[PDB]
């Protein structure tokens, strides 16, 4: 687990053979990480859109460990001010908001 | 309630005597709402910062009802692509992330 929100909900993830930190972000549809090298096929995706779009590489069905939960989901790889775990992967780990 | 994350976590809020919709956004530090007229004193606050800053009006100790829970917290009023309930109010309602 239960994560309270007095601080930013930053968690450790394992991806592409590296340990990274990322923000659990219920306001984000998608997961965006920078400075990871993922194997295999990808397609460009345009994201953002305010002021222009940002082009990223979309990798599908990526194995990722988020806080000890091994799951599978789409990871967008591209520059981002903070690594972000979006709703796409929060559903995979069974993460809910509760009050 | 328990809110799953397959869709965007949009909830009804009551503020400044109006019903509004807003996104429960764990990636946001602050709460930003547009098109609301709040009484009393405020101070400008600079937010954002990438590409420039956006100036908003910061109102403190605002009574707000979020999804049934009557709480008090800072509300920033200004243009926002979508109304956002940030961590500052999620702590007030006792909202946690759980998996």
């Amino acid at each position: 687990p239960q994560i309270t929100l007095w601080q930013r909900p930053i968690v450790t993830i394992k991806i592409g053979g590296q340990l990274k930190e990322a923000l659990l972000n219920t306001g984000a549809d998608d997961t965006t990480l920078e400075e990871v090298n993922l194997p295999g096929r990808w397609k460009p995706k345009l994201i953002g859109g305010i002021g222009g779009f940002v082009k990223v590489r979309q990798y599908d069905q990526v194995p990722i460990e988020i806080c000890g939960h091994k799951v599978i989901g789409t990871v967008l790889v591209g520059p981002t001010p903070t690594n972000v775990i979006g709703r796409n992967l929060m559903t995979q780990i069974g993460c809910t908001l509760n009050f | 309630p328990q809110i799953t994350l397959w869709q965007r976590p949009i909830v009804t809020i009551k503020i400044g005597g109006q019903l509004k919709e807003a996104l429960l956004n764990t990636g946001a530090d602050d709460t930003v709402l547009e098109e609301v007229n709040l009484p009393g004193r405020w101070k400008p606050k600079l937010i954002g910062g990438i590409g420039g800053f956006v100036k908003v009006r910061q109102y403190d100790q605002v009574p707000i009802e979020i999804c049934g829970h009557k709480v008090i917290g800072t509300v920033l009023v200004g243009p926002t692509p979508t109304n956002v309930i940030g961590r500052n109010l999620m702590t007030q309602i006792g909202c946690t992330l759980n998996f």
Binding site: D29, L46, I47, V84 | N25, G27, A28, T82, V84
Partner: peptide, 7 residues
């Protein structure tokens, strides 16, 4: 901070 989304 404050982060949302959009393709």
């Amino acid at each position: 901070r404050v982060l949302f989304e959009a393709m």
